[PDB]
Amino acid sequence: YDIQAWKKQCEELLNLIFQCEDSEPFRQPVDLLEYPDYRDIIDTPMDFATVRETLEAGNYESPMELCKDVRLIFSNSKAYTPSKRSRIYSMSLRLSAFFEEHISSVLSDYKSALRFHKR
């Protein structure tokens, strides 16, 4: 029932994501010189370095907020992809499955700890 345990759990999961080859396109904010129409399609850029820095700054209150930003990485990739068969979109779908498999216990444990705290 540790209300703070999610933060190190999320740091560890981000470490695993940075070791995945599938994260390489998503580790840093998109380069607009490579993709000059990106901000015509994507309103809110997001990447894993931004998520890690926000976490380490103490600017997430809950793992739900981190999860929303990570899911934005994946919805941006789906929105920007010219094809469902894209290399970089295909990498996003595997990485998303990995992330979702690992974040589910982090969210469940946090929400259970908060319920215990307010019992």
Ligand X SMILES: CC(C)NC(=O)N1CCN(C(=O)c2ccco2)CC1
* Residue numbers at the binding site for ligand X (CB under 6 A): 25-26, 28, 30-31, 34-35, 77, 80-81, 86, 88-89
Q: At what angle do helices 6-19 and 48-56 cross, to 10 degrees?
A: 150
Min dist. Cβ of residue 69 to ligand X (A):
15
By C-beta, is 54 or 81 nearer to ligand X?
81
Residue nearest ligand X (C-beta atom): 77
By C-beta, is 85 or 117 nearer to ligand X?
85
Contacts 24+ apart (CB under 8 A), 92-100: 92/22, 92/25, 92/26, 94/22, 95/17, 95/20, 95/22, 95/23, 95/26, 96/71, 98/16, 98/17, 98/20, 98/22, 99/13, 99/17, 99/70, 99/74
By C-beta, is 34 or 40 nearer to ligand X?
34
By C-beta, is 34 or 101 nearer to ligand X?
34
Min dist. Cβ of residue 70 to ligand X (A):
14
